[PDB]
């Protein structure tokens, strides 16, 4: 007695299902006297009173209906009167292909580090269809490009999902931003499919460490620099970004010498004197300079800083005598003083010109570079000139040139 | 003429020289006539009228006067009168290992990178000596350690400056801090030493990506739950620090009939409801979780989510008859009206009870599972009862059960 139908879904109003009169066992001359009719809170079929027919009164969607289940079955009673009888008939419906597949939004992003190795899987969103069997069986595509392919597994249960897999490896620093483009594709009639597209964000990693300009900064400064003064700039490049291209610089291996004399910022990396220069202590710095970044890649240099020698000391002069006394009866020729001159420059700046200053009874006579000889040339006589006020002068041969005197007291004795 | 003398510094006040007198061409025999005196404005040496030796008159600090240069002598000038000549004496100051090394601090902290491999080196700073020669010359020495040891490279001049070398994997999740000593030696006699500790602190790298506890989190719960109550709580575990420990929680693969009743915390990670639950549209959720941490790095399972039926629909009843009619004349057994039942929930609360209510000549015989029909039982006529109000209750076997009525007219109609 129970008999099952099954036809398509999105059927036309009106169409065919089966002869119920005669698939139980009527006849067209006891048609009206039964009556029948379909008992159904879902208008979907009806009874043609005339010839037994079962037709179609609505639309029968089976995506409204059944949804995502596998079978779909519609149970209804038909009621036939003179006798009452009731009679279960039911109605299996068949899927069709009539919805595409959809992705969940049309732009996706996906951030992926550039240190992923060759060969790393990214999971990829699926593709979902209301429809069932093979209509709703998905097959992805990727479109070709030269660093991402496309991989598809199947669950437990044979539905695909995809998974895009890496075949060349990142790099933010060649091209930080990637468009890719997947495909879905159903295997039913006729086949439907959309696309979605990928935008591969590369996330930066410190995959490269600081890079000085010059290996070696070399400078030369005057002597007397002001302090506050800049000497140079260091520069380091890092081609990373964020955190991992912030650059510090800071020394190494320095001494208390040049910490009290130098300063390096470290942030602009600008070097300035603090303190003071001198040529006379120290006319050479070499100072080492670390470049550090936010993943502790460090990045060594060497800068030397040399000073010029400048014309700020001026000549000294020394001299000794025999108790600053002469006996009238001298000699010429007789030393009477003794000239010892130093500078602490070097070069020009240390030569000296040692001369005497006044018309006296003496002369200066050179021995050797930097002694002289106070040497008689007159006549003495204590009852006359009792005492002299002998005045030396020393030059150097600087720009500009510096001086300095001394008068000694030389005292005429009585003779013997 | 020129004369050189070569002793060691540090040497106590009154120490000799040299004898002067002899070394140029003198004589005690005419000390107290020349009067020998030295001139220089350091008062380092002096001279005894004596016996025309050269002594030392105040400490001679070779740090002091000539600092870190290689050579260092000291020029003067010895003044004799009767007669006047001058006498230029120089003396060489050799150094002796009076001064140890030492460091800039006696902690020094340094951040490494867990992500560093084998063989990586690190630069030391190195120690300073204010001595010269082999009494600076220093030898590095390190502690043993099964991770780090020492490199000892050498300039271009001949220093040596140490630098650590990474032996062994480093591993923040093992050991965090490391604790090092320094050591330097010089090549002076008596050999002078100092140490200094070095504090290595293991840098933070993601390497470890989140785990879940378990792969799947299975619950069950009712079906009439009430919109925000918790589910369950994922949880992932993550053994890195900071930013590469913070996870983040969502859903993958994931359709919008179960976004509209669930919700994952990002944070927490605990999944409540923000929907209907309904068992006769859906009984199983199979939902993908997705953990995500500052790397990157991901981390995936599924969670299943069974729903129980619930006794919350109540038995439908429909009827149909001979448009209401019966014949009073009708004989014993004929079915006057058909009786169809069903319920949507499932298990014994689908399992319908019919009956009748009341006392009617009628009575309900039951054909299949959800079909009945009314059959009369007894005598009628319209003269006496015209009509008749025929009720029929269907319960459920549920807990609590659920029932419902539906009352039907049926009229008598006279015979033939
Ligand atoms: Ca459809
Ligand atoms: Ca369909
Ligand atoms: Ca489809
Ligand atoms: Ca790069
Ligand atoms: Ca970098
Ligand atoms: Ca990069
Ligand atoms: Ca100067
Ligand atoms: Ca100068
Ligand atoms: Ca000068
Ligand atoms: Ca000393
Ligand atoms: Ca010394
Ligand atoms: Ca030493
Ligand atoms: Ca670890
Ligand atoms: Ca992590
Ligand atoms: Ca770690
Ligand atoms: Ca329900
Ligand atoms: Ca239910
Ligand atoms: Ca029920």
Known sequence: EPIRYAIPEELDRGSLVGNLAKDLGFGVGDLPTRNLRVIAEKKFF????????????????????????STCVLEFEMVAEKPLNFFHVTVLIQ???????????NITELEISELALTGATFALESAQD????????????????????????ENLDGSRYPELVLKAPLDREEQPHHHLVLTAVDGGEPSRSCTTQIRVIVADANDNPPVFTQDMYRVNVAENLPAGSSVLKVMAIDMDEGINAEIIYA?????????????????????????????????????????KDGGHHTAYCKVQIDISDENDNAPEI??????????????????????????????????????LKGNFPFKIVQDTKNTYRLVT????????????????????????????????????????
């Open 46 to 69: 009806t009874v043609s009173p005339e010839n037994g027919n079962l037709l179609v009164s609505d639309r029968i969607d089976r995506e409204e209906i059944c949804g995502k289940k």
């Open 95 to 105: 899927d069709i292909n009539d919805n595409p597949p959809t992705f969940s939004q």
């Open 130 to 153: 209301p429809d069932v069997g093979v209509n709703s069986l998905q097959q992805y595509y990727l479109s070709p490009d030269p660093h991402f392919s496309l991989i598809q597994k």
């Open 251 to 291: 020394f190494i291996n320095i001494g208390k010498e040049v910490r009290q004399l130098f300063k390096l910022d470290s942030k602009t990396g600008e070097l300035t004197t603090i303190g003071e220069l001198d040529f006379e202590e120290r006319d050479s710095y070499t100072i080492g300079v670390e470049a």
């Open 318 to 355: 020394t001299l000794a005598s025999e108790s600053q006394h002469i006996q009238e009866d001298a000699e010429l020729g007789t030393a009477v003083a003794l000239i010892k001159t130093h500078d602490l420059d070097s070069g020009f700046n240390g030569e000296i010109l040692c001369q």
């Open 377 to 416: 040339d007159g006549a003495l006589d204590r009852e006359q000139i009792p005492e002299y006020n002998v005045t030396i002068t020393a030059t150097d041969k600087g720009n500009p040139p510096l001086s300095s005197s001394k008068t000694i007291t030389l005292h005429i004795l009585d003779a013997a």
